[model samples]
Target: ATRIAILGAGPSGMAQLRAFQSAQEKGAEIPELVCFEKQADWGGQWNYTWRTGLDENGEPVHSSMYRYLWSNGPKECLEFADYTFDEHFGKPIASYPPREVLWDYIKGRVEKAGVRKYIRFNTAVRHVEFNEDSQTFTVTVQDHTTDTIYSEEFDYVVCCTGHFSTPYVPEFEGFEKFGGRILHAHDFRDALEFKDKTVLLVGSSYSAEDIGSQCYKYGAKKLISCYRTAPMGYKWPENWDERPNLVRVDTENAYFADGSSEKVDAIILCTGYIHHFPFLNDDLRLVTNNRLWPLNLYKGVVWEDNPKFFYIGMQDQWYSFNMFDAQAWYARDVIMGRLPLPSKEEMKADSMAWREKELTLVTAEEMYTYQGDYIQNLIDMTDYPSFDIPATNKTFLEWKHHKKENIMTFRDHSYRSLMTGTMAPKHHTPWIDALDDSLEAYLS
Candidate 1:
């Protein structure tokens, strides 16, 4: 059996183990797997920062997690082969479970699967080198507890370290001099700290919107959500009665409908993460920014440049866990030689186009386009059977288009207060300024 090393014990890493195990039951040769996790516990980021009580420094204090913070999409998307939390959480896993609970569920899967034997806790990977001649990997890991270094070798390496592992602190002209608490949402474990504090939130993704709403509901003294463009929220087609918190502010600046500026007690940046493959070389072709890929990936998995290493959890939609599960299954198949891989030329062209777009956009608008033609991408990775680039792109584009149309009325109805009247006097504009500006500036 080939020796396999899985990095990070996060959800994706565990998912990979599950997939490989399932494949083995079907007469597949299971890899000699050893998993490495930097944390003592199984949950990656979900391991709440135990030291901090109140994040006065503006780091997202985990104590303030909102009551409503559950998975936004249906839960079926994250279901696995052998067991599932679908029945426990109710059908469709339609609601997001609590972060801690989610982590527990993942840990339970790891234990139940008996994959814990393969895990090495408090072990952090420092670097990885592939000896193409030997078809093996030279891995350097640092023991966090002992402060000792060791090296090991493996036949293959699956890097499941997620994008959010690295923080993207924005460097504005006078960010250093601003003299306010600047924190990334990664530190945010909960929502208790936001209570009774004036808040200035940057970035308009689901995190931004969700955090903002939670802060407001938690009795924030004053809340100002900042983004260069107007934010968008989506609604489920089936659940017209309930609302969705999915949001997109594909720009750097914030829009305050009421036009008031206040000295915020704290500024929380829920800005999404960048694709960070720091250890990889130019040949491997890992594109990154404040730490993410500026363009849309094919179904948001493998980069166009490097197909050998797969990226899971780089996307978010209604059914995110589902996408990650699918990614793990497909990525394993491709790695095990069970599926045909993309041609080198195909990979190069896809990566180059994505890279060029990122370079040209230089601005936020181009960022969204580089991600994809549509502003908000909700891709179901399972939809791609062959994992072919063209087919995946076509399906994702179709989803993107439908979301564009369906999202409009949903946003209009939910945030009617912010969209019209005193807040937005500029008139009835759609939530696609970034999309239009990006295409016009670069793609044209």
Candidate 2:
């Protein structure tokens, strides 16, 4: 049988595995699957650890997950079509569950599919080189457990490794002179450490919003967040304040673009993440920021230059999980000869069409729906179960509206699932009062 190498056993990698397993279960012939995960466990970023910078084997730490993270988006938004939350947790759980609960939901699907055996834990893909003559990829992997460095040839390579772990920390003046602690959101662990300390966050995106809220919830003394384009216009609490971009910071205080300065106890750079692929060959490396239409990706999965290579969940996500499912299933069909590959010129033209449409979008509603429509396209091409993407975009709007109404108390609300069409039951305790983020505490 022809062999395929899948990099990283994250949600996307697992989705690809599940896609092949699903086909195999249906009595169809499949490729010899080999999935490599650098991390000791699966779930990728959801596999949380207290360690930072490097793992036990000196590989750069792979996860960006921190403690006290609840599902910022509703569980209904990312629900697996094949396995509903209603099926996983038995009846309706809350719309926004904590990290572990959602991780459990993701794991439940593939566990049932029995695809775990295909993955090699504690093994990292060091490099990948494609040979034009042979038309195959030689993947180098380091078996951390055995201290073995090896290379293997594969018919195809699926780059399921995601983009969120590596942080994009922009250079700022006086960072060296800054007296107190400085850290990225990726390294942020316990909010309890920031209690009674004035925190200055240096970004206005989702990380700043959620992590600032976390510090506040954990009893930080004061919160000051600065933004580049615009302040997050939510009506923040009394002590929570917003400012213009940070120009620089000194030993004691941070100076902003508005000529305002505040003495902060700690600084958190909630800037963003980069799409770094040091392993893939330079020709196969995807060079783009986080956006809807990443160039070189035909249909957001297949690589335009080399059709044998593919990617999943590489887009700036307004839709995740099931969106990866859409990509994975479509990628599977393409690999199994169920779908026809057009020429490279045709592929680039098709990709450019998506890039063109991606450029014209301005509003949040339009952006989400555009991604939803992309997912809808993939689902139409494959046998992946289709649900309402436009309807899911509506859910995205509702989530945005709720955040604007009250950023602090929004999790108290629930929404109807697009999968099972059942309204989710509210959590037992309001999110602010629910201090214990453990799975035992959540399900109880």
Candidate 3:
């Protein structure tokens, strides 16, 4: 029996454990599994915390989840084919649930699978090195509870430490001199913290869009978002303004590329995050930006350099939970000798093929369709239940259209789930008007 080490107890790690458990329930043998989690609880990024920076144990916080966050994408798009929302919640809930609701939904599946016992809570991985002679990995972990460091060997190491934990803060002129608060979106906890203050965000991605909207929604006096390539292009609220790339900032104001400047109270760098795996040795580390397709990972799961190593939920996502499920099931098959990986050359070629296609994608629809097809490819190779890819793709299309129609009202609209084929109920309160994002308020 092989001993497998899965790092992180977040969604991806849980998915991997569930994959093996599913096979075990059917009498298929599985390797010994051990999961290390830095946080006290599961759900990965979905695990919210009011604490930021170094946690109680002095380890960097594993979660970037903030308060009062609602799912930016529709729940239908991310519903797991193996376990539908209907199965988890007993019926269809709202299409866009709050953070707590999503966290509970993720936990319910793994809890039912009885995989919680395999997870080592409050354990942080310090370093991971591959031993060429033995063809195994030595993982060094620190148990915060014991305040002791220990080493362990494993036949397979699955890297599921998510990407969003590390904030990619860019250097800007006068940032040091700025008097008011300068923080990354990673540290942003509550919108009420910036009430009646002018908030300036740097970046055009979802973080900028959603965080800026959050501040505005929570009584921010003025919201300014600047982008390098293009704006989010939403018909934003009255006080919200989008500008070009930020050039520099003074103690009192920000200067943009377009020569416009604004007096800002606080600066929030919503400038995305990096795929940082400092624990892994250079050869085994994945080096790439957040994108639809990340190279070196054949089929977006197996690490090409070493087939025994796998990464889950590392791609810039269009499909979230089910995509992770597809990857997890495929990886489980490979470990179980049910699926055979190709040669390194063939794997590189496969990755290049996806990367080439990724480079040509110009629209959001194309990007998501590519991801959906990628997920379809994985599902076809594994025992993971298959749903309608075309219908899911269509849902993505509708989601984009809804955002374009009215960014604020998009969450208010409901979509039919691909797995259960049941239309979601509209939320009791409009997202913008839903001041209380507590799970209790949402369910009520």
Candidate 4:
């Protein structure tokens, strides 16, 4: 049997397990796969948390688990193609699937698929190294609770340890001097504690948005949602801050854009994560300057130097698991000889160019779209036509309608040409020209 080891037991890793199982049941040459997790249970870091905090009195602080602590995204989008949540869950609306509900569902799938027998929980993989002489991998696992280290040999390793496995705290000018309760988003378990205290939240990513909005809901006396700059065109539900106390800040007071810096009691940093692949050697590192390297990726999979290893879930995108499923599906086919690969150099070059393009956009035009720009990379790697540009005259009219928001000098003839005619329209600083510089840099 081809012995294989999968690193994480999160949603994406579990999907890979199910996919590999399908290949196994079909009487194909399937590998003996074992999945590992550092936590004692599945669901990765989404497990329920309870913390006891004090306000300098002996009184217990409030928790984040509120009546409305549920997913904003559609729960149905999380299910695998083979598993139906409605059939198994028996709930229509998912009651907005709580973290516990998701955890239970994951556990049930593992047991029903008999994938449980292959998982080792509470075991952290410290190192994964290639045994050049033996032509296999040696995965060194450590039990922090037990204070023991053990090694397991496998024919191959699939790393499911996600990009957000660790937190990356930015270097602020004067963090020590700020006399406030400083906490990373991971350490934050609830929102009620922010009540009566001024809160300063950092970052503009998903977690930041989620917690910033929640803290405001929980009655933060002065909730200052801080970011480096105003994230451009990110659609906030029209009534973003119905709460009077919440202030969205993107400045150098060192947080918001507007000039309103006040003394704060707590600082909650929802800043993004760092890629900490401890197993890999020092020479091969996760790209710094806030970008993650997929480690041996050829267009998001396949080892650049050695095609034996592949990676998944490094790319940032709009829909999370859907994109991962696509990446893993295509990578597995390449491994099983169902698909052929291009040169290793080409894969490395492609990833580097993609990453370099992102850096260029963020620096040059100052990216207003975080996830939108990420969508470009998925489009770059795949052969599938997920999005397309229409060339019809009607398409131009639709485009003109969208562009009307940016155009100042509006001519009747130019508008007609842009909407229904073929001739080029006269323009002074068109919207397309404004978007061109940044779009080109990102797509390059």
- The sequence of per-residue lDDT tens digits that candidate 1 reaches over residues 248-338 is 2212322233444345466677676665665566654346443233343443455544454556665433334434566677667766877
lDDT of 3 by residue, 333-373 (tens): 99999998889999999899989989999998998999999
Candidate 1 minimal-lDDT segment of 10 residues: 413-422
Model 4 regions more than 4 Å off: 51-69, 94-96, 144-147, 231-259, 283-285, 288-296, 349-444
How do the residues 211-283 of candidate 2 rate in per-residue lDDT, one tens digit apiece? 9989999899999988886546688879988998999888989999989988999999999898999897678
Shift in Å, residue 335, candidate 3: 0.5
Distance from true location, Cα of 164 in model 4, Å: 1.4
Better of 1 and 4 by TM-score: 4
lDDT for every model?
Answer: 0.53, 0.90, 0.90, 0.54
Better of 1 and 2 by TM-score: 2
The root-mean-square deviation over C-alpha atoms between each candidate and the true structure, in angstroms, is 12.5, 0.9, 1.0, 12.6
Each model's total of backbone clashes: 26, 0, 0, 7
Kindly report which residue pairs in candidate 3 clash with one another.
Answer: none
TM-score (C-alpha) between model 4 and the true structure:
0.69
Global CA lDDT computed for model 4: 0.54
- Between the candidate structures 3 and 4, which one is better when assessed by lDDT? 3
Give candidate 3's error at residue 345 in angstroms. 1.3
lDDT of 3 at 10: 88
Q: Which regions of candidate 3 fall more than 4 Å away from where they truly are?
A: none
Off by over 4 Å in 2: none
